[PDB]
Design a binder for this molecule. Structure first.
Ligand SMILES: C[S@@+](CC[C@H](N)C(=O)[O-])C[C@H]1O[C@@H](n2cnc3c(N)ncnc32)[C@H](O)[C@@H]1O
Length: 279
């Protein structure tokens, strides 16, 4: 549903990789009472950076020129890439006008306005502005209903052999896409799944609730405009294997048969690497 992602429709807007449960850590208190306990904010930021370390595991940024972030949040991913790699040109789309304002300000404050452009545009309806070597979607695609249009937009603006990296959910069997649904989206848009890391255990550790029942409910009443009661369902689903949080590494393959992309992608979807076994 809508309680799957860090935010529904360093300022990262994703869950993080917690190798283990941290006693006392509350993502809810950390996000909505951030002044009260500083160590929580820092632990969460480290975990969101660890998510990104794994997401980028195979990417050689020295080799890439152009980057598209199709749901760019507050622009932190574009800013970090731009600051650390002076040759990159980067574009971001967000459907939020407020986020676009923040992104533009943060880009200019970092002196990156000559290399990063931000647009308030819809990645399923508005063509990306250029051709890209690297496309980022970290907790974005699941929020976009018209995934066929999104993946056509990705394909049409990705150079052959270009890379798509995503953080998103897999339904292991209605809302999140199953393996077969993801495979249809990739295979019908010239995309091969190269490698995927399953961080479900570690995202669940991030979501672990340290407040006992009555205390948690009292906290959520003081906070009153979200509904925090449903996040327990996401935690239970990740613990039980009903859904997985997956870090996808995908390559554009313009010259392969679509049925053979599907055949190879299905095999790769059976080879997901748990983060605990990743190195
Ligand atoms: C959970 S936030 C993640 C933001 C960023 N990727 C990050 O990791 O911090 C989801 C982002 O997707 C954007 N988004 C949702 N639907 C979109 C759409 N159709 N087109 C462009 N952006 C979209 C939101 O505006 C928001 O910026």
């Amino acid at each position: 549903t809508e309680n799957l992602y860090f935010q529904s429709n360093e300022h990262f807007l994703t869950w993080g990789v917690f190798q283990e449960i941290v006693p006392g850590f509350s993502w809810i208190r950390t996000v909505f009472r951030p002044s009260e306990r500083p160590e929580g904010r820092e632990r969460l930021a480290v975990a969101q950076r660890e998510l990104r370390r794994v997401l980028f595991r195979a990417v050689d940024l020295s080799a890439i020129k152009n980057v598209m972030d199709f749901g760019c949040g507050h622009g932190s991913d574009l800013i970090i890439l731009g600051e650390q790699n002076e040759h990159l040109k980067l574009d971001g789309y967000t459907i939020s006008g407020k986020q676009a304002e923040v992104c533009k300000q943060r880009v200019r404050t970092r002196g990156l306005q000559n290399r990063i452009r931000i647009f308030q545009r819809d990645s399923a309806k508005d063509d990306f502005p250029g051709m890209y070597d690297l496309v980022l979607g970290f907790e974005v695609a699941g929020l976009i209903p018209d995934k066929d249009a999104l993946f056509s937009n990705i394909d049409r603006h990705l150079t052959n052999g270009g890379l798509l990296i995503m953080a998103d959910f897999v339904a292991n069997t209605t809302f999140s896409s199953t393996r077969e649904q993801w495979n249809k989206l990739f295979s019908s848009n010239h995309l091969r799944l190269v490698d995927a890391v399953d961080v479900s255990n570690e995202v669940a550790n991030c979501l672990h609730n340290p407040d006992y029942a009555a205390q948690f409910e009292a906290l959520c009443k003081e906070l009153k405009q979200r509904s925090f009661g449903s996040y327990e369902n996401v935690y239970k689903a990740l613990r039980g294997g009903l859904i997985s949080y997956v870090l996808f590494h995908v390559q554009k393959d313009r010259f392969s048969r679509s049925d053979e992309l599907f055949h190879l992608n299905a095999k790769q979807f059976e080879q997901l690497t748990p983060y605990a076994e990743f190195a």
